[PDB]
Design a protein around this ligand. Structure first.
Ligand SMILES: Cc1cc2nc3c(=O)[nH]c(=O)nc-3n(C[C@H](O)[C@H](O)[C@H](O)COP(=O)(O)O)c2cc1C
Ligand SMILES: Cc1cc2nc3c(=O)[nH]c(=O)nc-3n(C[C@H](O)[C@H](O)[C@H](O)COP(=O)(O)O)c2cc1C
Ligand SMILES: O=C(O)c1cccnc1
Ligand SMILES: O=C(O)c1cccnc1
Lengths: 216, 216
């Protein structure tokens, strides 16, 4: 059951390099990434999935220097996912989203399609013109995908760890993200933990509900 | 299987008001909220869980004006969760987190406790003093909790919808959040969909992976 998974999952501190995802697991993690929800189904994201040693080495360049403890995680995991957010809101993307919704058969009429597009544009306009927070808004949706992903991969029986401990400017330059209109936010290595993962046997710790939660 | 869950879940557009969470499901959703991961185990969040008519009516005040379509969802769902983020980083919270980790038995020595606290404080200081983005950073963690929650509730067999379509200023004032140092970000009604939920029978739509995903 999913509660057992939420209580048993942990942030892996060390991965077993000999243990690779099955072909089926590799496809499943890509499905999890794709099918996350997002505000207005905006999907304001790109994913880099590194599974070769060369690919993972390129991602790990971002952990050089101050983030050296992140490096082994990045190199030793089977697959490494880099979660990127769109930095500017392009109208091309919004059209792409609604054209895909149309192709998938979500609209009964042209008028329903037009209304969906109008709603999405309105929301995007509120964030960019009224709140001046569109970059933040898009990044929040990516963090939502990360949360979905971490629970999903645990429910597949895989070990993972979310990493903010890397240099985003280096990762951006390594993959040319700035010019494509993306920024890297979170790196998530995925695989199986090794016997050196000290966190696997430690109790989980959270604040009590009487501190964080009010019932009304 | 979790992939089936991710592919079958949907944003509910209409709830069945007669269909309530079981007592056990109500406890399980609160556990999901508590046990989400967060950067540095910072847990920079508060949750309001409304299950009474009075409670849910208070939340639904925020679905006024531009947000009237959110009102039915908030009133008709069994339980409504408001996800709030801390707005100022208080040192009291950071001390509380590490004191809880200590009580749960995560540290072998006083030196390991001190190092954990030092790391957490360093990270918090980078966001507040160097990046000037601490509010954004805390809100990102709450969105991560939301993504965890949405998949978890689906795996429990419950329907949900995430809502950004509400008036946060009204919700903040209704519960006195500003003075407590929180801001409401996302409202998630939880329950069972009704036969009027038009989204339950529509195909799910996402951009193809050849647009959103690069393998390296
Ligand atoms: C957004 C995010 C960023 C994180 N960054 C790191 C990181 O850079 N290095 C690391 O060792 N752990 C990292 N963690 C793991 C957290 O410390 C961990 O989630 C938290 O202590 C709760 O423990 P758990 O994940 O075992 O439940 C990160 C977690 C999240 C959610
Ligand atoms: C952060 C967030 C905010 C959302 N806000 C709303 C909302 O205000 N009203 C609504 O009807 N749906 C809202 N949605 C639902 C999205 O439109 C939805 O996730 C997506 O279009 C439909 O895909 P799904 O059925 O896979 O969730 C929100 C989704 C997310 C992730
Ligand atoms: O996804 C939606 O339908 C949505 C998102 C934000 C605001 N209003 C609607
Ligand atoms: O949670 C952690 O261990 C963490 C978070 C950010 C950066 N470095 C470490």
């Amino acid at each position: 059951d999913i509660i057992s998974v939420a209580l048993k999952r942990h942030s892996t501190k060390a991965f077993d390099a000999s243990k690779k995802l099955t072909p089926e697991q590799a496809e499943q993690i890509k499905t999890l990434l794709q099918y996350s929800p997002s505000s207005q189904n905006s999907q304001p994201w790109h994913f880099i999935v590194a599974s070769t040693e060369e690919g993972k080495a390129r991602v790990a360049k971002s952990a050089a220097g101050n983030y050296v403890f992140s490096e082994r995680k990045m190199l030793d995991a089977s697959h490494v996912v880099v979660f990127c957010a769109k930095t500017a809101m392009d109208d091309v993307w919004l059209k792409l989203v609604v054209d895909q919704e149309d192709a998938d058969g979500r609209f009964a009429t042209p008028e329903a399609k037009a209304a969906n597009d109008k709603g999405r544009k309105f929301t995007a306009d509120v964030h960019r013109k009224d709140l001046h927070d569109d970059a933040e808004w898009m990044a929040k949706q990516v963090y939502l995908n990360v949360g979905n992903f971490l629970l999903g991969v645990a429910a597949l029986g895989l070990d993972a760890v979310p990493i903010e401990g890397f240099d985003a400017a280096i990762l951006d330059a390594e993959f040319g993200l700035k010019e494509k209109g993306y920024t890297s936010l979170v790196v998530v290595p995925v695989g199986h933990h090794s016997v050196e993962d000290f966190n696997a046997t430690l109790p989980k710790s959270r604040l009590p509900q009487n501190i964080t939660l009010t019932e009304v």
